[PDB]
Amino acid sequence: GPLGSLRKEPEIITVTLKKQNGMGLSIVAAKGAGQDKLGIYVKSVVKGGAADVDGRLAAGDQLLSVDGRSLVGLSQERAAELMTRTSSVVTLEVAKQGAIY
Secondary structure (H helix, E strand, O other): OOOOOOOOOOEEEEEOOOOOOEOOEEEEOOOOOOOOOOOOEEEEEOOOEHHHHOOOOOOOOEEEEEOOEEOOOOOHHHHHHHHHOOOOOEEEEEEOOOOOO
16 A cells, blocks of 8 residues: 555664574564454564564564555565565564654
8 A cells, every 4th residue: 555654763664684594573463354454563573583683673563564565454474475585685664653752
């Protein structure tokens, strides 16, 4: 769908993968049996990827889009596929609900 929603602190998160291996990030969500668009939200981090390695990623990283591909209602299947061939560089837009001031 359409990208951009709120300002938030993060919004546009980008980090050079190829770090310890991947992004070692555990997402939580899907798409179906609802509005055909489930809100993507990180449940945790593999604690072994640029994500948990960038000391920023963790449970609470709603990705509105990934590599241009909207994630604001994607399925772990597709989302994962997108996050798969991310390359040594991952450029996705994440947002929070409210924390750290």
